[PDB]
Amino acid sequence: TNIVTLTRFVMEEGRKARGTGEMTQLLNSLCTAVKAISTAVRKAGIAHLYGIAGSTNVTGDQVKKLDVLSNDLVINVLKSSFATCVLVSEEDKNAIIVEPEKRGKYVVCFDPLDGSSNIDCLVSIGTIFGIYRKNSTDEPSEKDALQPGRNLVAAGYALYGSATMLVLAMVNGVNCFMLDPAIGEFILVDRDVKIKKKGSIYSINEGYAKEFDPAITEYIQRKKFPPDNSAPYGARYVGSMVADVHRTLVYGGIFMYPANKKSPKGKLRLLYECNPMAYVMEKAGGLATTGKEAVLDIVPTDIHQRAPIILGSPEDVTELLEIYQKHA
Numbered sequence: 001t002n003i004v005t006l007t008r009f010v011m012e013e014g015r016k017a018r019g020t021g022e023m024t025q026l027l028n029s030l031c032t033a034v035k036a037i038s039t040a041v042r043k044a045g046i047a048h049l050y051g052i053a054g055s056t057n058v059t060g061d062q063v064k065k066l067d068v069l070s071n072d073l074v075i076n077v078l079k080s081s082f083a084t085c086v087l088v089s090e091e092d093k094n095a096i097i098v099e100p101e102k103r104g105k106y107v108v109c110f111d112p113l114d115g116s117s118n119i120d121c122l123v124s125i126g127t128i129f130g131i132y133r134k135n136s137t138d139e140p141s142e143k144d145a146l147q148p149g150r151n152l153v154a155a156g157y158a159l160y161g162s163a164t165m166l167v168l169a170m171v172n173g174v175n176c177f178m179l180d181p182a183i184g185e186f187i188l189v190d191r192d193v194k195i196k197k198k199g200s201i202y203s204i205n206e207g208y209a210k211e212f213d214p215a216i217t218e219y220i221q222r223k224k225f226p227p228d229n230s231a232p233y234g235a236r237y238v239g240s241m242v243a244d245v246h247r248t249l250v251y252g253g254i255f256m257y258p259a260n261k262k263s264p265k266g267k268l269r270l271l272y273e274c275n276p277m278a279y280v281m282e283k284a285g286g287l288a289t290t291g292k293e294a295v296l297d298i299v300p301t302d303i304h305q306r307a308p309i310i311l312g313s314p315e316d317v318t319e320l321l322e323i324y325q326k327h328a
């Protein structure tokens with residue numbers, strides 16, 4: 001009978017810190033969308049929600065039925081939250097400007113459904129978000145979303161896996177909340193999460209081996225054949241960024257989606273995939289790099305810009321940076 005909900009947490013983390021309560025509003029609204037997406041996903045084959053929606057998005061993906069449903073759910077709750085002014089979604093070509101009577105101070109970048117390749121085989125999928133405070137006094141516009149990730153005030157993801165988890169990072173740390181399906185509340189289950197300084201798992205799609213740069217190649221070879229005859233790392237690659245990053249957070253190790261000979265900026269999207277996960281990792285004591293610079297320091301020029309990303313345990317990411325620096 002003492003429910004420590006996401007709501008309470010985010011409020012109790014603010015009592016002697018004169019806010020506006022808009023962030024709690026925003027996050028309460030997002031939680032409602034995440035619950036609705038979770039329920040849909042958990043019944044998707046009965047509800048006939050698998051398959052394509054007939055459309056390609058700006059970054060060239062095959063839009064799925066659950067992409068449109070989730071996108072609509074998040075847009076509508078953020079609008080009605082009265083906490084937002086500019087929204088950027090993977091699924092919309094342009095930024096969405098909130099109508100004047102519903103504007104609040106925040107800019108939200110999100111991936112409404114991440115891991116579409118895994119939808120139909122029931123593997124874990126998720127929702128990814130990053131929140132900024134609007135800076136300018138100018139009328140809200142797409143340019144308010146073009147901030148470096150270091151300006152994030154909150155970021156995180158929902159993981160629709162064996163259980164549904166909302167992982168929320170803010171200035172003071174990372175906390176995990178699990179959805180209780182019986183009462184429709186996110187309950188705190190992991191407080192002030194920190195990543196292991198060094199892990200034992202590497203996560204990458206090795207089908208791209210023919211296209212990797214020499215530094216990624218060398219690093220993978222080192223994980224399999226350690227020069228100091230330590231045990232080789234195990235390999236894991238679920239194929240859904242939210243699942244692979246969440247495992248990296250809670251078990252340690254490294255996740256990679258690097259640049260390659262065909263994709264100079266990699267595949268994952270900077271605003272609503274790379275920056276939120278880089279922020280979570282940095283707040284958990286981890287690192288997130290392109291191989292040459294910190295993801296959170298990139299100043300974007302395109303709301304659908306791609307970025308290479310290598311993230312996880314700091315000693316693992318640093319070892320790979322050392323190999324890039326050696327090859328440079």
Ligand SMILES: O=P(O)(O)OC[C@H]1O[C@](O)(CO)[C@@H](O)[C@@H]1O
Nearest residue numbers: 114115116117205239240241242
């Ligand atoms: O099939 P690939 O090229 O390994 O891409 C998988 C990645 O694509 C995404 O689905 C994003 O498009 C991520 O969730 C996942 O990390």
Ligand SMILES: O=[P-]([O-])[O-]
Nearest residue numbers: 111113114115116
């Ligand atoms: O591109 P997608 O799996 O969010």
Ligand SMILES: [Mg+2]
Nearest residue numbers: 061062090116
């Ligand atoms: Mg997609």
Ligand SMILES: [Mg+2]
Nearest residue numbers: 111114115273
């Ligand atoms: Mg995604």
Ligand SMILES: [Mg+2]
Nearest residue numbers: 090111113114
């Ligand atoms: Mg998506």
